[PDB]
Design a protein around this nucleic acid. Structure first.
Lengths: 129, 129, 129, 129, 129, 129
RNA sequence: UGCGGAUCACCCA
RNA sequence: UGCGGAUCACCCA
RNA sequence: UGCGGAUCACCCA
RNA sequence: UGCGGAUCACCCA
């Protein structure tokens, strides 16, 4: 085993699926990027740290690019029109058991499930009301 | 088309499900809490704002209780030993269309799907290896 | 020929054995933990480095939980009253061959074998007399 | 009884076994050395100390020599090409019972058992991977 | 998945092969060492970094030792009579796709294929003529 | 005899092959360029020198271009969108025989063989992990 | 306290 | 610590 | 940045 | 000497 495996970041039913693969582990930061030039790649980074005597903190980062082709100095280059950045920090007490942590994962999955308040608002460019 | 309604945060397949219901809306910050004491409740807050000229930023906070050896309705100190904190900040450039935002949501769902690296590590009290 | 695999740390003869499994690899420091909450888990970390021009140094750390009167999955404070810490540092001159290193390992196994002075004293809450 | 007895440090099946014997107890440090000149001897030292109000700390040291014969000033002397040094510190809480301490000993024996990750890496001059 | 694994550095048929194994990955620098005496070992290190806004730079190092036995005063140690030092730096713009990178690799493998100008000169203590 | 000849730098089956040819050998620096527009050409240079009393040092350079067409004001020129820069230095003591040099070459060819750690990382825009 | 160092019951921060 | 900011493993209070 | 040096992740202009 | 930078046989400490 090694959980540092590749996974499907954006699922579009097998056709046009954004897949992300292990690309770096330097400095304790696990990194994943899609098969693109470094300038147009989806990027995911993860790191864990004992943030205190009784706490552990996960720091996760996701970068979603809007791929474009730009003409700089009369030449064509693969670039990113802009990027969207997700930054999350999860602080878990050292007292949390394996079942306690599964409860945290389930909460995050239910938070972002299709049809629920938050993903509905984000997908429509609105707030909660 | 109001989206501030109750939803299932922790789905255990109908039996043992955790439901979170609207509980506050002070200052545009929508809040949802489970039916517990606030020291043991599941909490979710969400707010959107124009962080700058080029971006909008969603701030989602989630609080999850440590359930193992928990005494329902009891006083458990210190507070930090019994709660986990999730802090999410999504930055979306003002040029993102509904389609772009939908993709960004799929990426978040993909990052947390069962079997993937990040959720598997969190659930096993691990990092990447 | 990968050696970062799970192993039996505490052998009780098949029944009641404690298994430690790979859990982290941030910064070359390999980590193994038992299936518990991190406050009650068995932990093992290991790293090697060129401490100086003439030597290499292995740093092995082991954390063992106090099990008597322990409440599985519970919050036990203070942390120092419930854990034992083992700190090992092995310095091997760069001239040591595989044979030399094997002898050094046998010496460590010999020092801790059942019936010998050091382990017998540790197990009886004693010193030398 | 008196656990200050001689033991077999390096076991080679009865032939070429490095045996170590009680040689000193001055200043609370128990010492053992093999039957060699003090310059080529295997050395083991052990001491216990109440390192705090609620902690006890064992300090163990093992020295494995690479015996050689050197010619200084035209004369032959028994000496050590180089030495390997093992330094360990075990901190145990005063609350650990006799059964709790046996668990610590078992962990150290299982840590160094033939075929496991750590002794495998050390014996082959590599790291964990 | 992991690429910080053991690999054959020098291929001499089936036996006589020099194999290098992971030894350390501290501060973004991956290190590989061959077995036995560190003093006579082959060394391979690798690191990547963002050298500028548009460039990522690989820094690869290889050390080939000339195995020998030193003798001073009658004491003999395994050493390296001398070492050959390979030092390479590879700069690749961030607009390079996985296809462009594969070509850069083919170029490196071709520059050193048996029979070509450069490896021939090196193999014969020669230069170009 | 001469080793300042034409050779295949990038091998793509039988056709698509990049061939580099001698172009200049001024001041102890041998240079090889691929055919057509110098602006989109592959470049390879090589030089040797006595860097110190006991060492001779090779300095090899390779340039991989990203063929493109520039357009400014309507005039179009063949250019290189960008270039990948390989820079290597190989130091070899004067005591190295033709046999020792052949090993150094095998080590270089092995470091870059398909499948091994380093060429794989480079080919996938990755680092070590 | 140090996954700081050593010629190893000493030295350093 | 911030429901502070970013060009996103960095910056600010 | 050096077709600058090394005992090779350091040092020099 | 740099796991220092480059538009790459140059430039920096």
């Amino acid at each position: 085993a090694s959980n540092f495996t590749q996974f499907v970041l954006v699922d579009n039913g097998g056709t046009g699926d954004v897949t992300v693969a292990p690309s770096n582990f330097a400095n304790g930061v696990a990194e994943w990027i899609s098969s693109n030039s470094r300038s147009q790649a989806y990027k995911v980074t993860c790191s864990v740290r004992q943030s205190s005597a009784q706490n552990r903190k996960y720091t996760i980062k996701v970068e979603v690019p809007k791929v474009a082709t730009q003409t700089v100095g009369g030449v064509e280059l693969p670039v990113a029109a802009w990027r969207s950045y997700l930054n999350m920090e999860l602080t878990i007490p050292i007292f949390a058991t394996n079942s306690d942590c599964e409860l945290i994962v389930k909460a995050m999955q239910g938070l972002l499930k299709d049809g629920n308040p938050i993903p509905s608002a984000i997908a429509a460019n609105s707030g909660i009301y």
